[PDB]
Design a binder for these strands. Structure first.
Length: 122
DNA sequence: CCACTAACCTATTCACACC
DNA sequence: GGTGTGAATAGGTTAGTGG
């Protein structure tokens, strides 16, 4: 099961596109400011910038550095909890990831990244 | 029915602390 | 240099949106 898909308002689409036009590689501060200005969680903004670059690069392919998020600290206790879940299921859905976010205290978007990285390496 | 695309995915690299 | 791992990139796949 995946998270419920958002639908942009015209005002949100305009703000996303205008910020993309200024810089298609925003850092965490730009993404957080834009997220709050338009009322959308920052991970959804980051996912949109990724999809929009893919749309623009593909269309350019047949027509033709801002600061990163600070490294999330993961305690040994949080890691062991994620590892136990990973051993049972490597592809948790949104509800399983929200459970892990609740139990660990980490943002669900960091849980999602943790599982993507772990699958690539183990 | 079907085009578009948010959400999610893989593969690989960048960043950075640590020794 | 080497290791570990969180956050990024390019770009493919799945499934909901709406003509």
């Amino acid at each position: 099961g995946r998270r419920r898909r958002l639908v942009w308002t015209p005002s949100q689409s305009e703000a996303l596109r205008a910020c993309f036009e200024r810089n298609p590689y925003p850092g965490i501060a730009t993404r957080e400011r834009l997220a709050q200005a338009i009322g959308i969680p920052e991970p959804r903004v980051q996912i949109w910038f990724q999809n929009e670059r893919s749309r623009q690069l593909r269309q350019h392919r047949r027509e033709s550095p801002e600061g990163r998020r600070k490294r999330t600290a993961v305690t040994g206790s949080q890691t062991a909890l994620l590892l136990r879940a990973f051993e049972k299921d490597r592809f948790p859905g949104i509800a399983a990831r929200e459970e892990l976010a609740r139990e660990t205290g980490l943002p669900e978007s960091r849980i999602q990244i943790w599982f993507q990285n772990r699958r690539a390496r183990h």
